[PDB]
Structure formats: C-alpha cells, structure tokens
C-alpha cells in the first residue's frame, strides 16, 4: 500500500469540513478541540470553509472538494483531519485530486460520514487512511475521555513501525448525548465498564476494510467502494440507529455476499442503539441475518461514535485473537521516516 509519513509532536494538522458546518454550529466545542491540540504542540491550518454555512453543509460540492484539495497541496501539512461528519462527503469524490494525493501522501483521518472519503481515497490510490478522531466531536470532548482518545491517536500515528501493535482496551466508555457545545459539562457522563465481547476462537488475521456502514451505502457499487475480498476482516460501526435500520444494513451486506468472503467481523460500539423495546443487541440481529454462517465477531471495538475512540488504519492487516481477547495491527501503515 501507499503510506503517509508518520506524525510527530509539533507537526501541522489541517482540518476540513466535508459535510456539516460544525465550526459554526458547534463553535464552542470546535474552539475547545482546537485549544486541546494546540496545547499538545500541534500547529493547525484551518480549511477555507471554516466559519462558513450553506444551511445543512459547509459549502457547495465543489467548494468542499476544493477545501480538501487545498490541504493536500500544502507541503507543510502532515495530517488532514475532518472537523466533523454529516451526510454529504460522498458528493466530493469525483472532484478530489487523486494524483496530488498520490504525489503528496498525508495522514487522512476522521470517521462517520467521512468514511466516504477514507474508503474512496483508498479505492483510488491505495493510500492507508485512518478511522479515528475528528476535531470537533473527538477532541472537543470534555475530560476524562478525550485523554484516552488522544493517547491512542498519538500512539498509533507516532510510534515506530516495528513489530505488531496490540490495542489497549479503554477501561470505561460512554455514549451519552450530553455535554456537547458549552463551556462546562451539565453533569458527568455515565461511565460504563467495557463490555466488548470476542465471539469465536483462535486467531484471525486479514486486511481490515470498512467504516461507518450507513455511510458506505453512499459509495456502494461505485469505483470508490473498495472491493471486499476473501479473507478480509470487515470493520463496521453505526450511530443512533434503530434496530430496523441495523437489520436492513446487515441484510444489505448479506445480499452482497460479504459474509461469504470475510474471515471475521468487527462491530464498533453502537452509539445509543434503539432496540425498539426488543432488548436485542446488534450482534443478535447479525446472527439472524447470518443464517448459520459461522464468522467470528469482535463485538464492541472502541472505534466508533462512542467515547473514547481508538485510531485504526484501514486497508492493512489486523490480527484478532479470540482466545486471548485482543486485537493487533500486523502490517506497516506509515512510512518509517518523514
């Protein structure tokens, strides 16, 4: 794969708004996230749509593509980070400068709707991009959880690329929809013990592919959807969905023969899943849809809309040890030097 140069303390991070204009609509949280990264020593470059609104989005399709391309063209930038998702980054895909991305590989990171860009860029260029923090939701989170998110971000992106990397499991997590865009918390979030489950045995190693599953529907079938291959590990997460929607999306995968190919599935923790009173969890729905197909599942990986969030390279090999209950990156995902 095509690899970006690694991150280092003091580097420049550029940020872009490919969908929702949250630098305006969540401006307090945005400022807290900016301050958070600056205090860590990063220099920030604001994308040209910062502070702008076009109702539900930051700008026209072309304006948003331009905003992103301009960061790619900036030789001082090591990391290009989403401000926040939304619904609309898939629109940009015909207009991104893929040749410039190939010529100037950078760390591209975000999650949620930004999946369309992460997956589409990988499909077009082979660049290893990252499912991980977006500036506003992730780094504007109040302590204590933001510190755990940051620890994963800095570890994954700065560590020496030698030997496998085994993830640490956050001790506590939350998905509550509070403390969003004000100076002070209303009250502390509920902190849940980590209930991640490893359904299976032995060790499975394969290329990880995926992201936000609902968002993948916006690129599905196109040249921007990376082909899923035999032996891949499917990584999928969703946020604030009804069980009805989750069944629909899992069945979409089934119809597409995805479950005939993949050797394991990672379900990110689902933020505020709505079980419609059934008390069922997504894994149970997946099990019905699988119709007897035995695939080991890591249910509840902390790389999703829940806090804290780990950083995950997409398109490289991972190894899930279902017996020892751990997950590791086993393939180089950044260049050894800048």
Ligand X SMILES: Nc1nc(=O)c2ncn([C@@H]3O[C@H](COS(=O)(=O)NC(=O)[C@@H](N)CCC(=O)O)[C@@H](O)[C@H]3O)c2[nH]1
Binding site for ligand X (CB under 6 A): 20, 84-86, 112-113, 137, 177, 180, 212, 214-215, 238-239, 271, 305
Nearer to its own copies (CB atom), residue 7 or residue 123: 123
Residue 308 binding target from its own copies, ligand X, none, CB below 5 to 8 Å by type: none
Q: How far is the CB of 93 from its own copies (least distance, A)?
A: 6
Query: For its own copies, which residue of 63, 247, 284, 331 counts as binding (CB under 8 A)?
Result: 247
Of the CA atoms within 13 Å of residue 47, those in its CB half-sphere come to 31
* Separation CA 306–CA 268 (nearest Å): 9
Closer residue to its own copies in complex, CB, 208/213: 213
Alpha-carbon span 238 to 245, nearest angstrom: 10
CA–chain centroid gap for 23, Å, is: 19
Nearest to 268 by CA among 295, 217, 241, 302: 302
Residues near its own copies (CB under 8 A), total? 44
Considering the complex, state which of residue 124 and residue 240 has its C-beta at the smaller distance from ligand X: 240
Q: According to CB under 8 A, which one of 29, 32, 57, 106 is a site residue for its own copies?
A: 57
CB of 221 to its own copies, least distance (A): 4
Nearer to ligand X, 200 or 214 (CB): 214
Which distant-in-sequence residues (6+ apart) come within 8 Å of 170 by Cβ?
Answer: 148, 194, 302, 308, 310
d(CA 338, CA 321) in angstroms, rounded, equals 32
By CB under 8 A, tell whether 195 contacts its own copies: no
Helix residue spans in 135-218 (DSSP H): 135-139, 145-158, 213-216
Q: State which of residues 12, 245, 326, 328 lies at the interface with its own copies (CB under 8 A).
A: 245
Euclidean distance between CA atoms 51 and 152, whole angstroms: 29
Question: How many angstroms from the chain centroid is the CA of residue 96?
Answer: 19
* Contact (Cβ atoms closer than 8 angstroms) between residue 284 and residue 251: no
Beta carbon nearer to ligand X, 69 or 89: 89
Closer Cβ to ligand X, 129 or 214, answer by number: 214
Which of 8, 103, 185, 255 lies at the binding interface for its own copies (CB under 8 A)?
A: 255
Gaps in the chain after residue (C–N beyond 2.5 Å): none
Tokens coding 52: 């702008």
Q: Are 296 and 201 in contact (CB under 8 A)?
A: yes
Residue 54 binding partner per list ligand X, its own copies, none, with a CB distance cut-off of 5 to 8 Å that depends on partner kind: its own copies
For the bound state, the minimum distance from the C-beta of residue 186 to ligand X, rounded and expressed in Å, comes to 11
CB 226 within 8 A of CB 258: no
What are the tokens at 192? Answer: 């849940």
Give the nearer residue to its own copies in terms of CB position, either 136 or 318.
Answer: 136
90 binds, among ligand X, its own copies, none (CB under 5 to 8 A by kind): its own copies
For its own copies, the binding residue among 6, 33, 47, 86 (CB under 8 A) is: 86
- Residue 243 tokens, joined: 């069980």
Binder of its own copies out of 17, 83, 90, 179 (CB under 8 A) = 90
Binding residues for its own copies (CB under 8 A): 19-20, 54-57, 60-61, 86-88, 90-91, 93-94, 217-225, 242-245, 247-249, 251-252, 254-257, 275-278, 288-289, 291
């Amino acid at each position: 794969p095509l690899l970006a140069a690694p991150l280092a303390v003091g580097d420049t991070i550029g940020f872009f708004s490919s969908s929702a204009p949250a630098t305006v609509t969540a401006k307090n949280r945005f400022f807290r996230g900016v301050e958070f990264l600056q205090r860590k020593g990063f220099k920030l470059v604001s994308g040209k749509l910062t502070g702008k609104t076009d109702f539900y989005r930051s700008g026209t399709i072309k304006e948003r593509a331009q905003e992103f391309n301009e960061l790619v063209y900036n030789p001082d930038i090591t990391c290009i980070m989403s401000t926040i998702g939304g619904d609309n980054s898939n629109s940009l895909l015909p207009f991104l400068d893929y040749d410039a991305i190939i010529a100037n590989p950078k760390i591209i990171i975000g999650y949620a709707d930004t999946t369309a860009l992460l997956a589409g860029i990988y499909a077009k260029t082979g660049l290893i991009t990252f499912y991980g923090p977006a500036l506003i939701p992730s780094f504007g989170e109040h302590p204590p959880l933001v510190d755990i998110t940051y620890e994963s971000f800095i570890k994954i992106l700065t560590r020496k690329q030698s030997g496998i990397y085994t993830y640490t499991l956050p001790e506590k997590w939350s998905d509550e929809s509070i403390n969003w865009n004000e100076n002070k918390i209303l009250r502390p979030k509920k902190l849940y013990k980590n209930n991640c489950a490893f359904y299976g045995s032995g060790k499975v190693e394969g290329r990880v592919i995926g992201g936000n599953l609902n968002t993948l529907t916006g690129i599905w079938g196109s040249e921007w959807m990376p082909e899923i291959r035999n032996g891949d590990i499917l990584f999928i997460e969703d946020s604030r969905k009804s069980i009805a929607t989750v069944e629909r999306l899992f069945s979409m995968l089934k119809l597409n023969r995805v479950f005939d190919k993949v050797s394991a599935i990672i379900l990110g923790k689902h933020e505020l899943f709505d079980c419609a009173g059934s008390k069922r969890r997504p894994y149970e729905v997946l099990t019905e849809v699988l119709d007897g197909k035995q695939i080991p599942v890591l249910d509840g990986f902390d790389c999703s809309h829940t806090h804290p969030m780990l950083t995950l390279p997409l398109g490289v090999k991972l190894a899930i040890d279902f017996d020892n209950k751990n997950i590791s990156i086993t393939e180089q995902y950044l260049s050894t030097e800048k």
